[PDB]
Amino acid sequence: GEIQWVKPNKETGRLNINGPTRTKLEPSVFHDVFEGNKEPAVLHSKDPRLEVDFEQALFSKYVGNTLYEPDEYIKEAALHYANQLKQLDIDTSQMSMEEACYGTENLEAIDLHTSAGYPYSALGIKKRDILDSTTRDVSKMKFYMDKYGLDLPYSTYVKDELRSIDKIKKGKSRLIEASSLNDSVYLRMTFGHLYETFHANPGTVTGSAVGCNPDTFWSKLPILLPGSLFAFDYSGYDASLSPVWFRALELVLREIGYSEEAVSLVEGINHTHHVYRNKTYCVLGGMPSGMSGTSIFNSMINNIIIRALLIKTFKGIDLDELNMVAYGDDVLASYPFPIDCLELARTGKEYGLTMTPADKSPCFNEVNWDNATFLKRGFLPDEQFPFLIHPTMPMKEIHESIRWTKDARNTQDHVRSLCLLAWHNGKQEYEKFVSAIRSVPVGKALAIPNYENLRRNWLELFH
RNA sequence: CAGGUCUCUC
RNA sequence: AGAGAGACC
Ligand SMILES: [Zn+2]
Helix, strand or coil, rough: EEEEEEEEHHHCCCCCCCCCCCCCECCCCCCCCCCCCCEEEECCCCCCCCCCCHHHHCCCCCCCCCCCCHHHHHHHHHHHHHHHHHCCCCCCCCCCCHHHHHCCCCCCCCCCCCHHHHHHCCCCCHHHHHHCCCCCHHHHHHHHHHHHHCCCCEEEEEEEEEECHHHHHCCCCCCEEEECCCCHHHHHHHHHHHHHHEEECCCCCCCCCCCHHHHHHHHHHHHHCCCCEEEEEECCCCCCCCCCHHHHHHHHHHHHCCCCHHHHHHHHHEEEEEEEEEEEEEEEECCCCCCCCCCCCHHHHHHHHHHHHHHHCCCCCCCHHEEEECCEEEEEEEECCCCCCCHHHHHHHHCCEEEECCCCCCCCCCCCCCCEEECCCEEEEECCCCCEEEEEHHHHHHHHHHHEECCHHHHHHHHHHHHHHHHHHHHHHHHHHHHHCCCHHHHHHHHCHHHHHHHHHHHCCCC
């Protein structure tokens, strides 16, 4: 992706979008009980921790575009992924506006506890003023999509979250490109049934792990991904996507049966306008982060990328022997013979993608089940039942999370969630985590799950 | 102060 | 149906 132009809001006739300025994070009661390095990301031009210009750092993620139209490798990739999707028989029909707003069994309702985006945000109209879970009326909604249309700008906010020390100094805070309620509705009407299919089928037919539960999905993964594993990291995947990958997505959608009017919505994803504070700007390429289907489309595009990288980099690849799952930019894949990701990464740069080793070292060392990570978690066979696989969140990540809070009223739930993650690293680490928690007054007041109970409940998931 | 998935609590 | 937390693009 690449910023094509920047204009003042006076010039564009767009109203201003000023997000919050101060972090809601504070040191928790456990801040000094565990070691950690992360702090709240920079949210403001004049944060004293900054060491470069803040806004230059913010938009530096748009590294530019390379290919704009598919080559033979990307077209064979899109078609191969498309035919694979056909076995799911996705309903390419339009979803009812009622179901698109209020949800089905496999589609969650529009989040009514959150902003309605441009222009409703600036005019003080909240989602709850238009939609209502009880009446399920779409009448007010239909009026406002006719009042305001589609293809409305994304509102930009800086994301309030923990970041490493190095990303705070270099102003590398993340951004939220918030969609307008009208566009989430129309995207949900167009692709709602595809979202349903994807949510219900995490695995290697969708090629997507959206909807997976790591507690149970991890045991399936070595079976779904036989043979030699490959994986790597992307730098700023979403923002690095050139328009070729949105063209490629258009071919996948067409081949699985989508009408031309449905497929036309992709150009409105590839070419988007955004308002940050007092300025409008155009972005060509790049997936918007706050869009309906961001996770699924990023995941679908990743299935195209991996396939096209394979057949362009190496001779004699049979794409039918590829197995992979993606959760947006995160990928774990398998092929019957090892795949050299140093060569994949070189082909990647030509497609405008920056790919680095999985182990965060400089060398593309071997990925196997003892060091693979997915959604930040490792794979650890159970000592008693070696076919059941524990997802292992590193204790370093759990330490980082526990040291801070946005609302100390929910300390207990926060700690409980971290204990549901931590015990997979084994009894020794878990009791050492619990003891460290119990070492401060609030820690002695929390209902902490007992290790044996966590293990019992997990075993019972498999019966 | 966005789009989602997952899990937990009366 | 109401409330939270974890991880994600
Ligand atoms: Zn434009």
